[PDB]
From a paper:
Methanothermococcus thermolithotrophicus is the only known methanogen that grows on sulfate as its sole sulfur source, uniquely uniting methanogenesis and sulfate reduction. Here we use physiological, biochemical and structural analyses to provide a snapshot of the complete sulfate reduction pathway of this methanogenic archaeon. M. thermolithotrophicus activates SO42− by conventional ATPS and APSK, but transforms it further by uncanonical enzymes.
Inside the cell, SO42− is activated by an ATP sulfurylase (ATPS) to generate adenosine 5′-phosphosulfate (APS). The structure exhibits the typical ATPS fold comprising three domains (domain I, 1–156; domain II, 164–314 and domain III, 320–382). Similar to many thermophilic bacteria and archaea, the domain III contains a zinc-binding domain (320–343) that might contribute to thermal stability. All residues critical for the reaction are conserved in MtATPS, arguing for a conserved reaction mechanism.
Residue numbers in the entry:
A (entry chain A): 2 to 288, 292 to 381
B (entry chain B): 3 to 287, 292 to 382
């Protein structure tokens, strides 16, 4: 079985009685405006996706994840979940109860345990292994406010979720896995439609794992990216036409990527552990500044993670062997070899090209096409 | 990587020894042997049957029957014996005799003992049945009433059209070492490669250094591939689809007994002597179960060659790949199971095998032969 990171699955969803009280006096508490990513962090805290966390890191915890990728008690935790405010936005003090607003929506109530300062260069360097402003995460770290705020939270509202019905929470996914008699579950994280390489990895894992938990991540989109609804419906087509039934589950999680590379891959595994997964597929270049095998290399420092990473050797499609192969068993030259790249396959479709069937399933392509505009913007 | 019994046997007579024995064949009694026995003689003499240096005596014959092991407990499952009738027994114990295939002296033999046997016990213990319809049972009954044990010395081989491909254990071992191979997996066959065969061999290559493909030359039936077709088809396959220094091809001559699981052990022993560390055991290796050939290896933990059993696989015409039921949901019409007999029948009937059954270049190589098949 998979135990929740830290021992118990966290739940911070405020009770209807607690929600009514706080919202009856919104204007008496200090209101702090948060970004959407922080609003998503809050729902991940409240539904146990971030177990054991019950709020935003305090100073001791924050410095510990920076220096060691572990909490003070040595439990693995690699991605700082913090709340920042500028001098002018700090309309509260330690010991105060504050309300975090996304736009005009009260997202959560927070008990301010501690207000502290930090070194943005140290923050940037230890998390992303670089302090170059060109790095997106470094830039977002420098834009942070001067003060971080720690303390336990309680969720009052979620950001509107067009895909609520797919957004199963850890308590539901765990009950579902057991519902299906799965003892081992392998997680596959993605932000793209499935191509044949992704199907190969998932079915490879099925030969020593009971089921696959495909977990599309809902986050900020870039122009040219597949619409989440396209990704969802594409996978539903893939399973119906190519997967045995009761061998896969599709559920979505919301999460704003930090692009901290190998340090973020550990965070990804922790999230999937809490969803109930015992294994986690780690692809190359997970989360320009990080090497392809860096995200696999870091797991050697966490033998106490209690979620088994799965590393796959390099494979490609050969147009002479007519099969997914690897260099050991294929003598064919570069023209015959087709390496899988979701980005290149995505660019074919944007450019009016048909992906060959060794890149994408016929029915998957026709589902993507069934959309007037599959991509954002 | 060590020969069964400890050391590689060699019973090939030196040319000075051979000549002196052939200068006056007059002195020795002549005994006419069947071709299959002549094949057994060259397998003895080139170490394919190590530790055996000749035909088994009584104590060894009975032990193989009862325990599938020699008196010293070394695994040996197939008796290698020489049979003569009362009329053919123009010799006694202690005599030196000459074994002849037609007018060719195949070997010189020192007779240790002449003993009798129970043909029904023989047939039953080896083949698990005494049904005369069983080919091996009938050939056991046609054996002469006397078996003859003793060490042999080979003087000639029956003509071999495939001599150049019939590398002996001492040269295969030197070749495995020359290619830096530490582990070697044997794949025995009597058919052309289809994509299932290639799948298995390349699967093994992911955890062994190289593959030793070993076509077995024996009696043919009407409709069988000619052995030169099989060989040329494999050299076409390797050249077009295998990396260099991952495959070796060599032939061994051997007449099947059809003893099922008991012969699979004997097959693995032969490949051990050739230098292999692993041995692929195909299903149904008539009267025996498909997994029995795999079940028997449990009783031989000391065999020192590792059997390799593979899970069921087939080609799916919707997945467009070799898969297995665990990962494929599609119904029977999309599933193509690999049968060497079905694929061979197609070619005999003038049909083109789909490329998911047989490589394009392999089929073209088979086509290059005007009469690829054996005719009665
Ligand atoms: Ca700042
Ligand atoms: Ca005697
Ligand atoms: Ca008889
Ligand atoms: Zn190839
Ligand atoms: Zn299929």
């Amino acid at each position: 079985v998979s135990k929740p990171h830290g021992g118990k699955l966290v739940n911070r969803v405020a009770t209807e009685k607690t929600k009514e009280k706080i919202l009856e006096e919104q204007n008496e508490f200090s209101k702090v405006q948060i970004r959407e990513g922080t609003a998503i962090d809050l729902e991940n805290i409240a539904h146990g996706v971030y177990s054991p966390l019950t709020g935003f890191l305090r100073k001791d915890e924050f410095q510990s994840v920076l220096d060691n990728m572990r909490l003070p008690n040595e439990l693995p935790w690699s991605i700082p979940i913090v709340l920042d405010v500028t001098e002018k936005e700090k309309n509260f003090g330690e010991g105060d109860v504050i309300l975090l607003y996304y736009n005009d929506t009260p997202i959560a109530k927070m008990q301010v345990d501690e207000i502290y300062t930090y070194d943005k260069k140290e923050f940037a360097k230890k998390v992303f292994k670089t302090d170059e402003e060109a790095h997106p995460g470094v830039a977002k770290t420098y834009a942070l406010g001067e003060y971080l705020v720690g303390g336990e939270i309680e969720l009052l509202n979620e950001v509107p979720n067009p895909f609520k019905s797919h957004t199963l929470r850890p308590v539901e996914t765990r009950a579902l896995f057991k519902e299906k008699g799965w003892e081992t579950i392998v997680a596959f994280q993605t932000r793209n439609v499935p191509h044949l390489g992704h199907e190969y990895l998932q079915k490879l894992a099925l030969t020593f794992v009971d089921g696959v938990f495909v977990n599309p991540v809902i986050g900020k989109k870039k122009k040219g990216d597949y619409k989440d609804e396209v990704i969802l419906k594409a996978y539903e087509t893939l399973f119906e036409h190519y997967y045995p039934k009761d061998t896969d589950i599709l559920a979505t999680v919301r999460y704003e990527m930090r692009y901290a590379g190998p340090r973020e891959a550990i965070h990804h595994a922790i999230m999937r552990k809490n969803f109930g997964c015992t294994h986690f597929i780690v692809g190359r270049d997970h989360a320009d500044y990080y090497g392809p095998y860096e995200a696999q290399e870091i797991f050697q420092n966490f033998p106490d993670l209690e979620i088994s990473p799965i590393f796959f050797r390099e494979f490609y499609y050969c147009k002479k062997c007519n099969a997914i192969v690897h260099d050991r068993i294929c003598p064919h030259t570069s023209e015959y070899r087709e390496h899988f790249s979701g980005t290149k396959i995505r660019n074919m479709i944007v450019n009016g090209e048909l992906p060959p069937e060794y890149f994408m399933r016929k029915e998957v392509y026709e589902t993507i096409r069934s959309f007037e505009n599959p991509f954002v913007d």
